[PDB]
């Protein structure tokens, strides 16, 4: 029998890389639980057994911070035992949680551990599944930490002067016999007079080497002497005692196992056999506690005899496999470094060795442990009414700091000393927004009287929010993540100017209400109908970034599916300048001017900024345009500082390190740091040393050829004091968009970097002076954003690069495309038309299918509407120009039209019927196949070959198949129109289309329609005779034919118009009438039919068919039905019955009278859309001849034509009428076109609502 | 690969009674769907073939031996009868070692201490003594704050003209101990009074929990955050004119309440302020709970303040009849005409239950769920929506997993408007007492609000209500409701509250602590449209 | 030798109390993951196969809200199939995640399901450990939701 060996190593291993790997796994619940609980237990234990000074240096909140502090030398050697055991157990957990293999079992497994690797072996051997192993492994990690603490205490008990001497307590000596080493140790100790506690001892005895342990001072002196120069020696970097029964005792183990009782010692029995690394034999089966005690005894009291392990193992399985089938291999699962020693004897003189790996697949991480995608952005910045202008200003490297314009108020008059009086000025700088009064209140349902009383920041936030929503193609209530109750608003604002304070002209009910301070997010919620959580944050100079942190927290908790995070800063009341510009905190000069040897302060600036955030899964599923990905947000306080204002280097270092630990990234993965750059001479100095300490600690630091650039948007636009975070995030997102690091404008060419940063270049930390290429590659670009406040709070945000998904390029089968535009007024209609026309002229190579998708499915559609259809971008451009010239959607739409569904008769069949829709829409194909299966279950032959195959016309086809084909095709077409959102107001069918009209009206179900049609056709086939009657189409009023019908025994079959009638009768009578009316000049068309409905040929089947119709359920009509039989309307329950259906097939079809009566009753006007469902438009002519040319009839199918012109005409007419289309269903079967194109922004109908 | 997942355990068909030929996952799901939709389920064939399937197998094995039967819905009981010819058994068990408590999420939050200042109640003890007898402290402005006789003037068309005179201020607003907080006595008068009272209340709450920073894992200075909720700041950043210095706007803008608490107490964790006007404190408690559930902090200081030091706010609200020209809030009744503004301070210390149990802390109560939404689909932001409030309360109930009959008290927002309270009452009844003979049989539900005793805090309403509810569990008493006079009557829109087993206490009611915890629902709404709901449980006995 | 029989029932069972029990368990990582992922997959699937009016009434953000809306008659009969399969799989997951027992094995186990209880039987039979069963069970819950939609259409 084969078998597996699990090997666990000792402290000598390199575990930091593997542990870092474990902390990044994503789809393993038990592993995440194990890491969390192990940290929790060790955090509890380390307070009891550590002194106050040593605990403060090592205190950690998470396992990632623990792993960080270990490599920084902020922990003790006790933590290394715990972390190595934790790494081994986590590696086992991951290996068996990712492969999905069956858990190791007693009869096919062995476990072995070396020199404190036996704790994990005990834990693994005492479990039956990975669920039972979790608590046991957490307990084992606690015991390993306690073992480390005991060893550390014993190290200090022997060498109290070795707190600094953590030198190797062990070394490896090659080619030395154990007995010779023992004798030499004895002689050396006797001669040099070394106390008994400081003697060297042999920890390990391998076959080629031994390990000598002891105090570093005596150990080195023993080796650094003659009689040992020949031997090659290496030091083991472990610095703890172990494997000494002359120093440790059972009492030490008893102290270790103090806080570990389980009520039954066999609460956990042992399952997998356990092998000793000091004996090489199988340990007698016991329980968990009795096996941990054995492990600790072997670790602290005994020599690790690796030589006996080599001989013990072969013999162990040799006596085992022999009773088994034969000698068979040994899969070896290892944890550290002993795998390849085993085969030395395990491949010859013994059996074999192996290894493996595997994995299943699952779905993305949940709400936590997952990244957040920024899908759109917008805002307003100084001199930049768009993000495009903001980038154009960043790229060229301009500073826009300026004084208040003379148009509003002059600073010269206000020139005055300290403002002891009211309205006294003391400052002149400030970057305001000139475009502050512009608004479109009608778009947001706000009266123009109310608009001047609104806070300008609120109005700009409204418009920016709509622009950001447009840029992501976000339509509420269309995807799971965009349900109105799953969208929250997180605003960050610190100072509100003329929102709650200055208002003095008039006071009304709408003064406090709507604008206190919480009505920015509240008004956004109301105006956009967002029914999720809503918050406002005041963290003064980090309000927006802290609000983004809160939004991220809500998304990680699950409180929302989409977040609207933004911020505003307005200085509309400059009266606050005087108070702040007193102690020189403000600036009496130009822009922020970040770090340099000229800084004197910062200049206040206004702005708006919005970003839409989802979880990455939801943005990937929605086909949204991801701009970037948020990895971590972190906030702390510099509370341990001389003052809140004074920045603390330690606090900022801690915050940046926390963000880095959370993301799991190295400082060399970051190519840009977006600094707060407050602009103070000392303020920037603290942040620069924090950045360098975190990212470029030294010359020759891990920065070798990967430069780090630094900069801040505060150099270009000023200090936003509440929009700084959103401003910086928008700048960084627009850097990834254009693949360019902008030049830094803080330092002039003739100036110099501040002397406190003397060798920035030597550290590979640069400041761009010209635009730098920043190409997008397969490796994402990472940025760190910093925000601080004089209140002491620090926020740090890590932003990544969006992935490349697939964008499945593939040609669209459609020949033409629809481009839709809409607006709430006429001016906006004209503006949007002009903007799209100019955009298409400027980008003539755009994708037309994706343009249609973006304009229709990813937009909300307003009152005024326009549509255009073209085969290429140039045709669309020409048609848009014509629409601009005529002024299509500029006039108010007027009431919506009624929709009438007309169903054609049985004279419209032809091979390859509706095959184009069958090949275009999978839903139509599924419906048609469902109906074809439904008919077969009713006992009728399959009709699907009529609509697909091109062979056979009438020869092999009976009436039943063709009638059912027509009817089921009409029902499928009804379903397809219903999916697109087209709801008929009334229905009418001619002869065989009556059943489809009843199905559309809700009277009959699909099965009842199929049953009635098929039973009628079968009765017709069985009883009547083929070819006895004929029909005659006559261009004469039915009154004028009274004499010819009352003498030749004919009858009126259909009355299709004022002067169109169809007569039926025997062939001889039909021929006689034809001759008689040809002699009179009348024009008649003779039609040869196998069966003539609405004639005397169907008398015999009348009684039989009425009995069969009793089994069908006739329900109440859901919409009006036009009855050519009764020549009136049906709107009650009892009108349509088995008696109605029997008369319908025998009496005359008075379509003209039904249409006329519907017109007189006002039910259908001339401005109604008649959508003709059927294989061929025949009722269109009837409607045109009966009602007039002012009524629009829209066919669906035709024999030799493309569906797309007709289908798109139907959709365009319905859409322009005012009805809502399910545009997502029209684009659904074409995945190539499902990408959002970046079109212009909304054509706001802007007006200046500035209050004097 | 169709065999991405092969089959391991043998599979028996419920339409044949035989073992299905081994296949992969996809080929076996197709067989299952074929049996479900295309075939007859033959239970007799199953009963005949299952015994024979084992007989042909175990006979080749040692012997036929018992059968453990593991069930999920039913059909066991049939098998032991058909099997008593041989072999049968059943199953149960939960026997793995305990673990470390549920993590930062999926875990309850313990309120370990509280403090605050309320009208005529400089302590939480005076506040309870006032609740117990059902007193209302609606009162006019004294000369200490501002004299109305100096404002005698015709219709106030000028600047700073008042229209209402009521208001519940705190007489003890100027008292402070600056030296304890390392603040110069010259700096103290320039501080916002709300800030100073928040400082003292925070220290008192810290004292009541026995909390000493840097002494336990959860009390390291870098693991303590401050979450304040404030909506209106009076004489904090705007009014001051007698004296101005450089340190006037700096230190007190609005974010310096939590910032100053962070600096004075040396709390180096996250710090936030919330403006949700009439639910700022409860939404701030929600944010603190979210930070604790995420792991951003180990201890949270959630509170709120409301100051009316500048009475300018009276004029704005008294235009659409929103404010009251009469006494206290007077919640739901056929007498409501408005609400009276009130000031206050309130603090609570929150941890995760594990950390409070390990620290031997005095747990006052446990938070189970916080929920926030918006009544955005309403005719106006001001107008309350019954559907939105029902959705919020239902969301809280779904999250906690509790039945509506587990709740013995509802702490209502009780805004005091004639129509405002009507909407909340039907929401409460729809969620909690939907009908007569509803699941309420012998388990009464009481309703009330602290707005009847102290007024409308407009930012301390959430903390005020939470503190009131925690002091009801302390004294095991449901206080009398003072909204309705003995000679008055309930509003006609609530005709048969009693028939539904929904009562309003008129005398102090015994509310004993038993082995079954007492659950409370707290409601907070704002004219901005936001609704917050907090579910508070009873602390365990350790 | 002894064997074990795992039985899964049909939609006739009373699953709301048992499902409410599962949503309250606290120290089971795989069960919590299973509930979360099953809700996620069904939430994705129910937008494609539901009309706009019927989807708005049944839209849920979490599994507890789904279980609430089921008892209020705000869902369709298609959700009953999905929720019964989900309850059966969650009950199996909890039973084997709380006892710490060795996962069922081919040589000592049999699986049987009745009248749509066979989906959970197939999912359980195609796994070697509880870690491999999680994705398979989420897929099976999706297929059970799709089975209910097909029968509602018929």
């Amino acid at each position: 029998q084969s078998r597996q060996l699990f090997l666990f190593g000792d402290q000598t291993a390199d575990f930091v890389p593997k542990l870092r790997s474990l902390l990044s796994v994503q789809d393993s619940p038990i592993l995440a639980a194990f890491l969390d609980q192990s940290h929790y237990v060790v955090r509890a234990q380390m307070l009891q057994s550590m002194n106050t000074v040593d605990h403060k240096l090592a205190r950690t909140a998470d396992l990632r911070q623990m792993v960080q502090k270990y490599v920084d030398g902020k922990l003790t050697p006790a933590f290394r035992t715990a972390l190595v055991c934790l790494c081994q157990l986590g590696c086992f957990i991951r290996e068996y949680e990712e492969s999905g293999n069956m858990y190791p079992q007693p009869s096919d497994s062995y476990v072995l551990g070396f020199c404190m690797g036996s704790l994990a072996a005990v834990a693994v051997s005492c479990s039956r599944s990975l669920s039972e192993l979790l608590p046991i492994a957490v307990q084992t990690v606690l015991i390993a930490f306690r073992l480390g603490l005991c060893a550390l205490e014993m190290r200090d008990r022997v060498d109290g002067c070795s707190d600094d001497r953590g030198d190797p307590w062990s070394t490896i000596v090659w080619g030395l016999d154990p007995q010779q080493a023992r004798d030499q140790i004895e002689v050396f100790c006797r001669t040099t007079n070394v106390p008994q506690t400081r003697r060297p001892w042999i920890s390990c005895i391998s076959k080629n080497a031994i390990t000598l342990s002891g105090s570093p001072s005596t150990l080195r002196a023993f080796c650094a002497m003659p009689q040992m120069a020949q031997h090659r020696t290496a030091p083991i970097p472990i610095c703890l005692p172990a494997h000494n029964g002359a120093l440790f005792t059972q009492a030490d183990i008893t102290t270790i196992l103090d806080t570990t009782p389980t009520t039954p010692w066999e609460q956990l029995p042992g399952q997998i056999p356990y092998i000793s690394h000091v004996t090489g034999n199988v340990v007698q089966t016991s329980n968990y506690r009795d096996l941990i005690e054995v492990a600790l005894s072997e670790t602290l009291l005994e020599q690790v005899r690796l030589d006996l392990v080599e001989t013990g193992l072969p013999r162990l399985l040799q006596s085992r496999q022999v009773k088994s089938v034969t000698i068979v291999p040994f899969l070896t699962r290892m944890n550290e470094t002993m795998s390849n020693i085993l085969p030395d004897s395990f491949i010859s003189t013994e059996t074999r060795t192996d290894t493996g790996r595997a994995i299943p697949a699952s779905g993305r991480p949940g709400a936590g442990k997952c990244k957040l995608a920024i899908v759109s952005m917008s805002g307003r910045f100084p001199e930049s009414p768009t993000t495009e202008s903001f980038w154009d200003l960043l790229y060229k490297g301009l500073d826009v700091c300026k004084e208040v314009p003379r148009r509003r108020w002059d600073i010269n008059t206000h020139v005055d000393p300290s403002g002891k009086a009211r309205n006294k000025g003391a400052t002149k700088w400030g970057c305001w927004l000139d475009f502050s009064g512009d608004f479109d209140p009608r778009f947001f349902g706000i009266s123009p009287k109310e608009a001047p009383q609104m806070d300008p920041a609120q109005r700009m936030a409204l418009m920016s929010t709509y622009e950001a929503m447009e840029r992501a193609g976000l339509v509420p209530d269309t995807t799971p993540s965009t349900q109105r109750d799953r969208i929250g608003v997180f605003h960050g604002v610190t100072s509100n100017d003329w929102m709650e304070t200055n208002t003095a002209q008039n006071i009304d009910t709408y003064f406090i209400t709507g604008g206190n301070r919480g009505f920015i997010p509240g008004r956004i919620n109301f105006c956009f109908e967002f029914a999720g959580p809503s918050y406002t944050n005041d963290t003064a100079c980090s309000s927006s970034l802290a609000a983004i942190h809160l939004a991220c927290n809500s998304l990680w908790r699950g409180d929302c599916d989409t977040a609207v995070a933004g911020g505003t800063n307005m200085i509309y009341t400059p009266d606050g300048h005087t108070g702040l510009d007193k102690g020189f905190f403000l600036s009496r000069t130009g822009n922020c001017k970040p770090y340099d040897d000229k800084a004197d302060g910062y200049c206040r600036a206004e702005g708006v900024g919005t970003v839409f955030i989802k979880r990455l899964e939801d943005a990937l599923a929605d086909n949204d345009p991801i701009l970037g990905v948020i990895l971590d947000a972190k906030t702390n306080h510099s509370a341990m500082s001389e003052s809140m204002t004074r920045p603390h280097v330690g606090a900022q270092i801690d915050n940046m390190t926390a963000a880095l630990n959370t993301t799991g990234l190295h400082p060399n993965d970051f190519s840009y740091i977006e600094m707060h750059g407050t602009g103070t001479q000392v303020g920037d100095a603290v942040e620069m040393e924090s950045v360098l300490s975190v990212f470029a600690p030294s010359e020759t630091a891990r920065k070798a050829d990967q430069p780090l650039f630094v900069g801040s948007a505060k150099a270009n636009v000023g200090h936003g004091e509440g929009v700084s975070g959103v401003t910086s995030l928008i700048k960084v997102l627009m850097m990834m968009q254009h693949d360019t690091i902008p030049p830094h404008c803080g330092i002039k060419p003739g100036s110099k970097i501040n002397r406190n940063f003397p060798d920035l270049g030597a550290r590979n930390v640069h400041i761009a002076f010209e635009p730098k290429p920043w190409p997008r590659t397969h490796t994402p670009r990472r940025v760190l954003i910093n925000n601080f406040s004089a209140a002491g709070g620090n926020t740090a945000l890590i932003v990544e690069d969006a992935p490349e998904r697939h964008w499945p390029t593939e040609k669209d089968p459609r020949s033409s495309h629809i481009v839709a535009l809409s607006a709430h007024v006429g001016a906006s209609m004209k503006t949007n038309l002009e903007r799209l026309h100019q955009y298409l002229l400027k980008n003539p190579h755009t994708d037309l299918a994706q343009l249609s998708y973006t304009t229709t499915a990813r937009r909300w559609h307003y009152l005024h509407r326009v549509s255009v259809t073209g085969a290429s971008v140039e045709e669309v451009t020409r048609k848009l120009e014509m629409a601009i010239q005529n002024g299509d959607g500029v006039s108010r739409p007027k009431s919506k039209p009624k929709i009438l569904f007309a169903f054609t008769g049985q004279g419209s069949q032809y091979a390859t019927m509706g095959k184009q829709v069958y090949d275009a829409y999978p839903s139509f194909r599924e419906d048609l196949e469902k109906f074809d299966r439904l008919a077969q279950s009713h006992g009728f032959p399959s009709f699907l070959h009529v609509c697909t195959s091109p062979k056979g016309d009438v020869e092999e086809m009976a009436p039943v198949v063709v009638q059912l084909a027509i009817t089921c095709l009409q029902m499928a077409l009804t379903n397809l129109m219903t999916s697109f959102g087209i709801r008929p107001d009334v229905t009418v069918g001619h002869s065989l289309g009556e059943f489809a009209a009843l199905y559309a009206a809700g009277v009959l179900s699909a099965s009842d329609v199929v049953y009635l049609v098929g039973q009628r056709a079968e009765l017709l086939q069985e009883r009547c005779q083929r070819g006895t009657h004929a029909m005659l189409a006559v261009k004469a009023t039915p009154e004028a034919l009274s004499q010819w019908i009352q003498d030749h025994d004919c009858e009126v079959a259909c009355i299709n118009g004022p002067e169109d009638t169809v007569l039926s009768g025997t062939t001889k009578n039909v021929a006689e009438v034809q001759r008689a009316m040809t002699d009179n000049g009348i024009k008649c068309t003779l039609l040869k039919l196998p069966f003539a409905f609405h004639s005397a040929q169907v008398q015999p089947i009348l009684d039989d068919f009425e009995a069969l119709a009793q089994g069908a359920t006739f329900a109440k009509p859901q919409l009006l039905i036009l009855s050519p039989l009764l020549r009136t309307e049906i709107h009650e329950q009892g009108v349509v019955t088995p008696s109605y259906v029997a008369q319908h097939c025998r009496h005359t079809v008075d379509m003209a009278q039904a249409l006329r009566s519907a017109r007189e009753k006002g039910l259908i006007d001339d401005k109604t859309l008649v959508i003709e469902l059927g294989p061929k438009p025949l009722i269109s002519g009837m409607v045109k001849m009966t009602l007039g040319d002012k009524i629009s009839t829209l066919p669906t199918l035709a024999p030799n034509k493309a569906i797309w012109p007709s289908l798109q005409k139907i959709l365009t007419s319905v859409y322009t009428g005012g009805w809502d289309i399910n545009w997502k269903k029209y684009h659904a079967p074409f995945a190539s076109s499902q990408k959002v194109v970046d079109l212009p922004s909304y054509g706001w109908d802007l007006k200046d609502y500035y209050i004097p």
Side-chain angles (χ1 to χ4, degrees), chain A residues 918 923-944 947 964-976 996 999 1004-1011:
Chain A
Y918 180 93
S923 86
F924 181 94
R925 171 176 353 111
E926 265 155 2
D927 249 354
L928 208 79
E929 271 153 354
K930 277 171 198 167
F931 294 144
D932 180 62
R933 290 197 296 265
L934 180 64
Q936 272 167 294
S937 73
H938 264 305
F940 315 131
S942 179
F943 67 80
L944 204 65
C947 312
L964 269 182
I966 294 164
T967 309
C968 293
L969 192 90
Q970 292 170 311
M971 278 181 345
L973 279 169
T974 317
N975 284 339
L976 185 75
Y999 169 85
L1004 294 171
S1005 75
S1007 327
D1008 284 341
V1009 170
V1010 170
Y1011 168 64

Side-chain angles (χ1 to χ4, degrees), chain A residues 442-620:
Chain A
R442 223 162 254 132
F443 185 91
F444 298 102
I446 284 141
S447 173
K449 304 172 68 58
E450 160 71 41
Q453 284 107 78
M454 272 180 96
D455 174 43
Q458 270 226 87
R459 322 197 287 248
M460 274 186 285
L462 276 171
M463 293 206 276
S464 296
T465 324
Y466 183 67
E467 284 166 352
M469 205 197 321
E470 226 187 352
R471 258 154 184 184
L474 194 148
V475 196
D477 287 312
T478 48
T479 53
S481 13
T482 34
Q483 306 297 328
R484 271 164 205 288
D485 64 322
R486 305 293 296 148
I487 302 160
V489 182
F490 305 80
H491 204 78
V493 49
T494 194
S495 274
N496 296 55
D497 271 47
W498 219 321
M499 183 162 179
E500 47 164 304
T501 308
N502 194 11
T503 288
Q505 262 272 12
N506 201 11
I507 298 96
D508 75 309
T509 188
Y510 305 108
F511 159 63
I512 276 169
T513 77
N516 153 286
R517 215 187 227 195
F519 289 88
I520 317 211
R523 200 73 173 261
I524 283 163
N525 276 274
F526 185 75
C527 278
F528 297 97
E529 267 154 77
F530 297 146
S534 176
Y535 298 102
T536 322
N537 183 248
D538 203 331
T539 286
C541 296
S542 39
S543 309
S544 308
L545 217 63
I548 288 161
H549 188 182
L550 291 172
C552 291
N553 261 6
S554 268
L555 280 158
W556 281 317
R557 274 289 301 166
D559 301 354
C560 56
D561 274 23
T562 304
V564 183
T568 55
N569 188 74
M570 212 58 37
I571 310 161
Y572 203 48
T573 293
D575 201 354
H577 284 95
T578 304
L580 301 175
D581 194 88
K582 286 280 217 299
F584 308 103
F585 295 172
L586 258 287
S587 203
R588 322 214 175 202
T589 58
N591 212 303
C592 201
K593 271 150 175 143
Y595 27 86
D596 187 291
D597 205 283
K598 267 221 91 170
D600 73 78
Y602 64 78
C603 178
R604 307 177 60 196
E606 309 183 322
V608 177
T610 317
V611 298
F612 270 66
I613 312 134
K614 296 192 203 210
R615 299 186 284 280
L616 184 60
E617 61 196 354
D618 286 327
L620 283 170

Side-chain angles (χ1 to χ4, degrees), chain A residues 26-34 97 134:
Chain A
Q26 274 292 20
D27 291 316
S28 293
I30 292 163
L31 180 66
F34 172 73
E97 177 156 11
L134 174 47

Side-chain angles (χ1 to χ4, degrees), chain A residues 274-483:
Chain A
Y274 178 91
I275 295 162
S276 27
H277 70 79
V278 324
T279 317
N281 293 10
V282 152
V283 160
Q284 225 297 291
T285 329
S286 349
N287 44 280
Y288 177 75
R289 229 197 167 260
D290 285 359
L291 268 160
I292 286 274
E293 99 193 334
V294 168
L296 300 158
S297 316
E298 288 179 341
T299 303
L300 290 181
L301 267 54
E302 310 240 50
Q303 226 155 33
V304 37
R305 294 287 294 288
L306 280 178
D307 54 299
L308 270 67
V309 167
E310 284 193 38
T311 290
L313 242 182
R315 172 163 88 279
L316 156 62
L317 50 148
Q318 195 128 37
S319 70
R320 221 75 190 272
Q321 264 93 312
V322 157
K323 188 257 174 52
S324 183
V325 179
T326 326
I327 71 191
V328 241
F330 250 32
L331 168 52
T332 297
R333 224 277 316 181
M334 66 311 314
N335 273 86
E336 272 103 16
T337 75
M338 209 99 177
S339 38
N340 41 75
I341 287 94
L342 262 302
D344 278 16
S345 158
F346 253 16
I347 63 133
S348 41
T349 336
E350 228 299 318
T351 48
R352 209 55 270 281
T353 311
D354 210 33
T355 316
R357 207 191 155 271
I359 204 192
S362 105
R364 160 101 197 130
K369 67 165 171 298
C370 80
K371 335 202 195 175
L372 309 176
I374 301 140
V375 294
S376 40
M377 84 189 142
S378 208
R380 307 273 189 276
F381 323 84
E383 324 290 337
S384 326
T386 41
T387 56
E388 283 88 9
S389 7
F390 183 35
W391 171 248
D392 292 301
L393 152 149
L394 286 159
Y395 175 90
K396 294 176 344 186
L398 298 325
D399 292 2
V400 303
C401 205
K402 72 155 43 54
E403 63 230 9
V404 83
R406 69 200 168 219
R407 269 264 67 191
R408 297 295 191 77
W409 144 84
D410 219 293
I411 297 154
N412 270 25
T413 302
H414 268 204
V415 173
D416 183 275
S418 50
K420 295 164 100 295
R422 292 213 296 107
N423 291 28
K424 309 311 303 176
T427 316
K428 38 182 287 198
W429 294 117
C431 337
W432 299 270
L433 313 180
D434 263 10
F435 41 85
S436 262
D438 302 351
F439 192 40
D440 192 353
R442 223 162 254 132
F443 185 91
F444 298 102
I446 284 141
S447 173
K449 304 172 68 58
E450 160 71 41
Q453 284 107 78
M454 272 180 96
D455 174 43
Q458 270 226 87
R459 322 197 287 248
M460 274 186 285
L462 276 171
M463 293 206 276
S464 296
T465 324
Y466 183 67
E467 284 166 352
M469 205 197 321
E470 226 187 352
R471 258 154 184 184
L474 194 148
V475 196
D477 287 312
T478 48
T479 53
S481 13
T482 34
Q483 306 297 328

Side-chain angles (χ1 to χ4, degrees), chain A residues 662-682:
Chain A
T662 326
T663 59
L665 307 165
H666 198 263
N668 278 198
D669 304 354
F670 290 69
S671 4
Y672 194 77
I673 303 296
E674 169 67 3
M675 292 175 69
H676 186 74
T678 173
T680 310
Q681 170 47 224
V682 188

Side-chain angles (χ1 to χ4, degrees), chain A residues 846-864:
Chain A
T846 61
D847 196 330
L848 185 69
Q850 289 176 3
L851 178 67
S852 77
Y853 174 82
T854 304
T855 51
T856 55
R858 307 293 293 238
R859 289 273 182 287
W860 175 271
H861 301 288
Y862 298 94
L863 187 60
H864 299 58

Side-chain angles (χ1 to χ4, degrees), chain A residues 697-714:
Chain A
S698 50
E699 331 185 5
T700 66
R702 308 301 97 158
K703 317 221 92 90
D705 87 88
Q706 55 232 132
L708 185 84
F709 278 79
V710 299
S712 72
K714 309 223 171 33

